[PDB]
Amino acid sequence: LIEVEKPLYGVEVFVGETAHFEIELSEPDVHGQWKLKGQPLTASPDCEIIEDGKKHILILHNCQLGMTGEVSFQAANAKSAANLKVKEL
């Protein structure tokens, strides 16, 4: 079973760069899935999820004015949730 010892972290970002949410589980060799307030989409339009089994890292390029929810991750039986807000000019 996993317990997630390090939760995510809320952070702002300017629509154009890339955000970064990290989270380490209690057991290595694991896989899950990231999403906005709670909607699993597909890395292609404005999302880039990457993982090597040793840790889980998130990367969101040019985020739009929306994305005003929380970055919640899901895996074996754990679930994190940081704050995500987009900023304009």
**Strands, E assignment, the chain:** 11-14, 21-23, 48-51, 56-59, 70-71, 82-87
72 near 37, Cβ under 8 Å? Answer: yes
Give long-range contacts, CB 8 A cutoff, 24+ apart: 46-55.
Answer: 48/18, 53/28, 53/29, 54/28, 55/22, 55/23, 55/24
DSSP assignment, residue 58?
Answer: E
Domain ranges of the chain: 1-89
User: Cα separation of 49 and 36, whole Å?
Assistant: 12
The answer to whether the CB of 9 falls within 8 A of the CB of 82 is yes
CB-CB contact of 34 with 51 (8 Å)? no
CATH architecture, range 1-89 = Sandwich (2.60)
What technique was this entry resolved by?
NMR
